[PDB]
Write a protein that binds this ligand. Sequence first.
Ligand SMILES: N[C@@H](CCC(=O)O)C(=O)O
Ligand SMILES: [Zn+2]
Ligand SMILES: [Zn+2]
Length: 259
Amino acid sequence: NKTVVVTTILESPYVMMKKNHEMLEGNERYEGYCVDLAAEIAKHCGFKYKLTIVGDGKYGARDADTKIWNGMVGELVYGKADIAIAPLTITLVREEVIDFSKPFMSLGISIMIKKGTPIESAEDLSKQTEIAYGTLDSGSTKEFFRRSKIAVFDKMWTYMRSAEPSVFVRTTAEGVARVRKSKGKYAYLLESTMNEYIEQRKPCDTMKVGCNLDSKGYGIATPKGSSLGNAVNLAVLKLNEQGLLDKLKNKWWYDKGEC
Ligand SMILES: N[C@@H](CCC(=O)O)C(=O)O
Ligand SMILES: [Zn+2]
Ligand SMILES: [Zn+2]
C-alpha cells in the first residue's frame, strides 16, 4: 500500500483553506464536504492519501484542436493522480477517458443574477443583449452549451463564444465577482449546488432564478483500469445507504439565516 494522490479543487464548500492553513501542513490545510468525503472513502478502501490541488485550477475539458485534456480529468488521464474527489460532473465525454462512481450529489445548471436584474429564465437571457452572461471556462457547464442543439441553449452558445470582452471566467469566484460588480449587466451560469451556497451568504446580493437547465451528478473519478474502482463504488454506495452523504451535505450547506 502506497500513498494515493487525490486531485481536487478549491471550490467552496467542497474544499476550502482552513483559517490557519498557514500554520498547518498536509491534508490538514483543508476542510469542506469533499475533504470529509475523502477521509471516509479512504477509510473504507483502506488507503492513505495525499490531497493535491489541481495544478491548472480547472475541472477538465478536451482541447478542440489538440484533443488533450486539462484540469483534474487530465491529472487522471495522464497518470499524475490516482483519484479525483471533488464536485466533478459525470458526463459522456469524460466517461470515455476515465471512470465514475455512482453519483454522490445531484445538481443541474442554473442562473445567478444580481438582485434587481430583469431575468427570470434562460429564455429571457437568450432574447436580449444588454445583460451579458457566461460560464466557468473549462468545465461541464461550458460543454453543455457548446454541444447543445436545443434552440435557446444553441442561441446562448452562439452569443457566448463570440462576445467581447470574453464572458468566460477562470474560476467560480471570478464569475461570482463579475456578477456583483457588473451592476446587473452580467449573469452567471453555474451549477445549483454552488449557486445555493453563495445565495445564502453575505452580502446576499445575488440569487438563483428559474429552474435547473438539466440534471446530473458529481462522481468520484478514477483512471481507466484503476485498482480502486470497485472499492470506491462500494464505499460511495455504503455511504449513500447509511444517509451519510445527505447529512454531510446538510452540514456544509447549513444556512445561518445570514440572508
Ligand atoms: N462541475 C463542473 C465545473 C463547474 C461548472 O462547469 O459550472 C465540472 O465538473 O466541469
Ligand atoms: Zn490564506
Ligand atoms: Zn464511514
